[PDB]
Amino acid sequence: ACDYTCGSNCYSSSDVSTAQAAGYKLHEDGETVGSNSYPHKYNNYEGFDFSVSSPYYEWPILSSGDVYSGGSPGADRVVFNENNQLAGVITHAGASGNNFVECT
Numbered sequence: 264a265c266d267y268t269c270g271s272n273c274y275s276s277s278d279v280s281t282a283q284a285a286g287y288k289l290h291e292d293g294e295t296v297g298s299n300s301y302p303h304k305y306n307n308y309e310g311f312d313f314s315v316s317s318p319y320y321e322w323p324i325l326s327s328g329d330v331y332s333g334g335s336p337g338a339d340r341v342v343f344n345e346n347n348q349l350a351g352v353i354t355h356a357g358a359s360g361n362n363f364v365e366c367t
């Protein structure tokens with residue numbers, strides 16, 4: 264059930280998988296949505312120890328279960344690479360400024 268905990272939001276592997284597929288599809292087509300143009304490159308300023316190689320891209324994952332479509336992105340993000348491999352699930356929740364912390 265609670266595979267990933269982002270602040271108080273609980274995500275299953277299915278939730279992450281569904282969000283990742285949607286974000287990768289848009290990346291593949293070269294399209295973006297929302298005021299911050301997702302999905303966009305994630306430079307890894309936080310220095311997370313990802314097991315998959317870059318480049319990384321961040322895409323919002325919504326607590327409601329809906330697939331992000333341009334509205335309010337919220338605090339949570341799924342990070343995937345060019346091979347459509349999951350790098351990690353991160354969040355602004357519990358972090359300072361525009362920084363991210365990993366979901367556990």
Ligand SMILES: Nc1nc2c(ncn2[C@@H]2O[C@H](CO)[C@@H](O)[C@H]2OP(=O)(O)O)c(=O)[nH]1
Nearest residue numbers: 299303304305306307308309321361362363
């Ligand atoms: N915090 C953070 N921001 C990143 C990173 N990669 C790209 N960004 C973008 O760098 C700027 C400063 O944080 C923002 O535009 C942010 O996009 P988001 O705000 O959409 O995440 C990253 O690794 N960490």
